[PDB]
Design a protein around this nucleic acid. Structure first.
Ligand code: MG
Ligand code: MG
Ligand code: MG
Ligand code: MG
Ligand code: MG
Ligand code: MG
Ligand code: MG
Ligand code: MG
Ligand code: MG
Ligand code: MG
Ligand code: MG
Ligand code: MG
Ligand code: MG
Ligand code: MG
Ligand code: MG
Ligand code: MG
Ligand code: MG
Ligand code: MG
Ligand code: MG
Ligand code: MG
Ligand code: MG
Ligand code: MG
Ligand code: MG
Ligand code: MG
Ligand code: MG
Ligand code: MG
Ligand code: MG
Ligand code: MG
Ligand code: MG
Ligand code: MG
Ligand code: MG
Ligand code: MG
Ligand code: MG
Ligand code: MG
Ligand code: MG
Ligand code: MG
Ligand code: MG
Ligand code: MG
Ligand code: MG
Ligand code: MG
Ligand code: MG
Ligand code: MG
Ligand code: MG
Ligand code: MG
Ligand code: MG
Ligand code: MG
Ligand code: MG
Ligand code: MG
Ligand code: MG
Ligand code: MG
Ligand code: MG
Ligand code: MG
Ligand code: MG
Lengths: 136, 98, 181, 44, 85
RNA sequence: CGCGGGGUGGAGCAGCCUGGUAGCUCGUCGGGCUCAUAACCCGAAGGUCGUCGGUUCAAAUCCGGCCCCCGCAACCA
RNA sequence: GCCCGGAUAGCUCAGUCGGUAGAGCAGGGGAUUUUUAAUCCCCGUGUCCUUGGUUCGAUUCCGAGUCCGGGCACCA
RNA sequence: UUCAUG
RNA sequence: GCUGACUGGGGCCUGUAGAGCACUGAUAGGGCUAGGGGGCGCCUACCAAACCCUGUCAAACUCCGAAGGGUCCCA
RNA sequence: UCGCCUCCUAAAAGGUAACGGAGGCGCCCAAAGGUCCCCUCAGGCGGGACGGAAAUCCGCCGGAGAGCGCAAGGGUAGAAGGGGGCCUGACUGCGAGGCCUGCAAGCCGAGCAGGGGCGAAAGCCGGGCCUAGUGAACCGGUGGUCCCGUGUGGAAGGGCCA
RNA sequence: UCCCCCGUGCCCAUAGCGGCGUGGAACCACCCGUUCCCAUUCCGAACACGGAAGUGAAACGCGCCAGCGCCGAUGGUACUGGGCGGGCGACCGCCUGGGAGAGUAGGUCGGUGCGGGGG
């Protein structure tokens, strides 16, 4: 929503801050390969889950599309493309926990996060609970 | 604060740093690049009772005689809270021509 | 002079009264008085020769000290003045001049504001620092109707050497400030 | 406009740049000339 | 057919020629009077002993000597030529 | 698909000058005229100045850029 | 860049070739007023661009300067 | 001498 | 006429990879709570600034910031 | 779009491209220059008569988040910010030394002299906090000039300096 | 020769902020006055001069405190010169040297020169 952006491709290299743990909720989709998760795939997986376990619990989208994916309108090369074909893209490296469902039981969570991984372009693991923690 | 620092706008050597207290006035020739105080002079712990303009003149006389006691002729005035005034160092024996 | 009547009342009653009140441990621990500032907002710098520095002389003849025109820091376009300059009058009164001004204020000026049920003792709040406004500027014992053109309500702020508000409360209420309870 | 200070009925244009609406009009600046040191140097 | 069905007005091909900034005589270089040391835009390197600051903060040695630096932390990163003999 | 041009009162338009000073006709509302409607006359009033973000003390004014509308091109094969 | 002409009211302008300041329109008031114009009578918004100067007194004359409208001319 | 209609 | 590419020892420079929010911005959940919405008189869900814990992202952000690279000296 | 400046792409020296991303300049300023002396910001908390929620005032917490004419960085209060006084160094001759570069340009420049400014003095001042704000040459103009003056004296016209 | 105080620097927060007590023989400051120099777009508030009647109350100095701050290892990952592979790809793996950032343990309210004045 701010500072100037038709920003570059970057490169989806090594993942360490790209992937720490699951913080919110109990269960979590977690990526196993670096890929560009669009806003459309975020909304698609999230409305797969919330409609799967209907009126259910909390589904924290810990990623956020913050990168203008740019697409030229089928022509040659004069400058950057018009920007944001479907919109923005969360640059996701592996080990990153993308979605977390909260409180809803394992039978809905494992058959919801699997649907989210089926609409996402990344081969995923699904983590249960009891990750990295810090408190005494 | 009195952040004035007409300290560090002195890079020429032999820095005569003054101190105008409520009671005395102190003065000391410091050397730069090797910070060692060479000569110094208090006012009331040297001489005359607290008539401070005349005794601040007399502490300068005594300090310049202390400076020519080891042969130093070109110096540079200091003490950023100066307001160069009735705290006088109108002197002979120091060829700063101050 | 040096024997202001309010200053004498301070130095002879109030400081031992505050000592025997709070159980002080120092003569300088008592709240002294060090500042009475008078501010005049006065956003009036339009055309048709709007000078309006007669009020500076008016404030000077009230207090006994020629106030300074203070240029506005920030320029805002809501009230149309801009670019620093035009007007705000400030005067700052310290010792015996502050005391003769408070002799003119507390005994002669406030007793009169047009109703004057009192002052506002919610106004200190944390520092020493009692601030109080004035709607009509001509309550003072110098200036009546035939020396002005318009109403020039100032606001004063008296600052104490008091850490809290209770200490400055107990100071100024015996110096002669009334209050509202 | 680009205006040059002359030594007073003499040589030595001194070649400043004035801002004519904001003040000008007998621009007077003491200046060191090529010959006879220091003068008044009104512009143009 | 190659229906060239577009154009595009670029707007951002513009760059100033770079300035060769930075330091030029590092710690231990035997510089001479007027040999410039730091070519900078701010005053990242504050001038110390025997080093003048230029108009655009070009640090430069006022004497014949060997450069040494120091980072005075809060104060700044002084670059001063200590003279030789 | 790319240029350049508009957006201002209910509508059609002036405009607005580096930005601070906004209107015109008709329409409108109230009156006056008239048996009554027209027409005419008198009083005002009405607008987030295309949304949005920008530097600005301050934007309708200037800079972008996005949505509708207009005028252009879209050629050589 | 030179060369002309001009700075007179809210606007456009004439000036006894120094001894008085003025039109015309606009604005207002007043008369008739179906409508608005037109018409009629009366007042102004006036340092006569700015100063210096010549004269007894300056719009007038003299120079300087500023804006102001042009005419030609190059333009490396 | 102006001036349209129920 | 051993200075050279290369290397070793020193000394510096720098702000990339990383990483982190100390700034400029974008940010997800929860608590707190200034201005608009529910009838609105005090009033009502993160419909909503700052704080607050917990989360993150950045070529045009850097409190940090290596590998290295550059330069100078002695080899 | 063509030159210049700022970032970024630029891969921790430099440089480095594309019709790659994102902005600017064609100026300004006789104080926004010099020097001497003072003073600290924005913000938030409170408190104050008209007073906007940010006028002005007071008091705390405020180290730079304010300001520096202008875009952007770099910088910066131990001033480059704000104010006051005095002024003209927005000098004339040069300039060791470098930076940079293909040349041409561009940039910094201590120091010496003349002559001044400011300050008690140390010192600082050859424009502005800095990097943009421009233009080789040629041909002319204008002001000086100890230069040339087509036999000679002088002019024409040249040069040189501005 | 040691603590005490005053200036003055160095390292630049491991020394800062906020607390919590102490200091007044001196020193230092606040103070008492504006005649004296010079003062503040107003105000001897600041600056300055005169004083020494009083006080450590602020300010400052010097101690304890970890609350905030700041510093912060050992490790170990990241990253990577250099090499060699897998991966149609996005990219990853191994060896070789380096080796962070955050974090955690913790460390921490100075250390140190120089000249004076004092028991
Ligand atoms: Mg000093
Ligand atoms: Mg010209
Ligand atoms: Mg210089
Ligand atoms: Mg309108
Ligand atoms: Mg319309
Ligand atoms: Mg009607
Ligand atoms: Mg054809
Ligand atoms: Mg005329
Ligand atoms: Mg006129
Ligand atoms: Mg005529
Ligand atoms: Mg007519
Ligand atoms: Mg007519
Ligand atoms: Mg008339
Ligand atoms: Mg008249
Ligand atoms: Mg005349
Ligand atoms: Mg005359
Ligand atoms: Mg031409
Ligand atoms: Mg008719
Ligand atoms: Mg008809
Ligand atoms: Mg009909
Ligand atoms: Mg019928
Ligand atoms: Mg990175
Ligand atoms: Mg952030
Ligand atoms: Mg930043
Ligand atoms: Mg290194
Ligand atoms: Mg490199
Ligand atoms: Mg060798
Ligand atoms: Mg580089
Ligand atoms: Mg300046
Ligand atoms: Mg208040
Ligand atoms: Mg108020
Ligand atoms: Mg700032
Ligand atoms: Mg500009
Ligand atoms: Mg900077
Ligand atoms: Mg000044
Ligand atoms: Mg060259
Ligand atoms: Mg050059
Ligand atoms: Mg250049
Ligand atoms: Mg500049
Ligand atoms: Mg040619
Ligand atoms: Mg011949
Ligand atoms: Mg001849
Ligand atoms: Mg010359
Ligand atoms: Mg320390
Ligand atoms: Mg505590
Ligand atoms: Mg105690
Ligand atoms: Mg004692
Ligand atoms: Mg002190
Ligand atoms: Mg104390
Ligand atoms: Mg660490
Ligand atoms: Mg570490
Ligand atoms: Mg501590
Ligand atoms: Mg310690």
């Amino acid at each position: 929503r701010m500072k100037y952006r038709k920003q570059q491709r970057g490169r989806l290299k090594g993942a360490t801050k790209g992937g720490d743990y699951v913080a919110f909720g109990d269960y979590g989709l977690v990526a196993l390969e670096p890929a560009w998760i669009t806003a459309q795939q975020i909304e698609a997986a999230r409305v797969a889950m919330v409609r799967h376990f209907r009126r259910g619990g909390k589904i924290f989208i810990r990623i956020f599309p913050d990168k203008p994916y740019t697409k030229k309108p089928l022509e040659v090369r004069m400058g950057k493309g018009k920007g944001n074909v479907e919109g923005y893209v969360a640059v996701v490296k592996p080990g990153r926990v993308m979605f977390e469902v909260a409180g809803v039981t394992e039978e809905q969570a494992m058959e919801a996060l699997r649907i989210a991984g089926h609409k996402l372009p990344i081969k995923t693991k699904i983590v249960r609970r009891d990750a990295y923690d810090e408190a005494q | 604060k009195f952040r004035v620092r007409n300290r560090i706008k002195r890079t020429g050597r032999l820095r005569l740093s003054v101190f105008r207290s409520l009671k005395h006035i102190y003065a000391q020739i410091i050397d730069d690049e090797k910070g060692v105080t060479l000569v110094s002079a208090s006012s009331l712990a040297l001489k005359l009772k607290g008539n401070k303009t005349e005794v601040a003149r007399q502490v300068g006389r005594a300090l310049a005689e202390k400076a020519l006691a080891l042969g130093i002729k070109q110096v540079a005035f200091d003490r950023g809270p100066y307001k160069y005034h009735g705290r006088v160092k109108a002197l002979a024996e120091g060829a700063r021509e101050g | 002079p040096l024997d202001v009547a309010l200053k004498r009342k301070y130095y002879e009653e109030v400081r031992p009264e505050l000592i025997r009140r709070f159980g002080y441990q120092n003569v300088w621990e008592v709240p002294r008085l060090e500042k009475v500032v008078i501010n005049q907002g006065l956003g009036e710098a339009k055309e048709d020769a709007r000078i309006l520095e007669k009020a500076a002389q008016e404030l000077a003849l009230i207090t006994g000290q020629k106030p300074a025109v203070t240029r506005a820091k920030k320029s805002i376009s809501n009230f149309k003045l801009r670019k620093g300059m035009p007007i705000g009058l400030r005067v700052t009164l310290r010792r015996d001049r502050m005391w003769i001004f408070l002799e003119k204020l507390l005994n002669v000026a406030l007793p009169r504001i047009r109703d004057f049920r009192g002052l506002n003792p919610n106004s200190f709040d944390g520092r020493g620092n009692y601030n109080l406004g004035l709607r009509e500027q001509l309550i003072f014992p110098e200036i009546t109707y035939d020396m002005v053109d318009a109403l020039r309500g100032m606001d004063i702020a008296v600052v104490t050497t008091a850490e809290t508000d209770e200490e400055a409360r107990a100071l100024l209420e015996l110096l002669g400030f009334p209050f509202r309870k | 406009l680009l205006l040059e200070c002359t030594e007073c009925k003499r040589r030595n244009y001194a070649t400043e740049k004035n801002k004519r609406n904001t003040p000008n009009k007998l621009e007077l600046r003491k200046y060191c000339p090529w010959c006879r040191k220091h003068t008044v140097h009104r512009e143009v | 057919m190659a229906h060239k069905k577009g154009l595009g007005s670029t707007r951002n091909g513009r760059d100033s020629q770079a300035k060769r900034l930075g330091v030029k005589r590092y710690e231990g270089q035997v510089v001479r009077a007027g040999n410039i040391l730091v070519r900078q835009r701010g005053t990242r390197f504050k001038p110390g002993k025997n080093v003048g600051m230029g108009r655009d903060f070009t640090l430069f040695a006022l004497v014949d000597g060997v450069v040494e630096f120091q980072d005075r932390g809060r104060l700044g990163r002084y670059v001063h030529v200590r003279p030789l003999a």
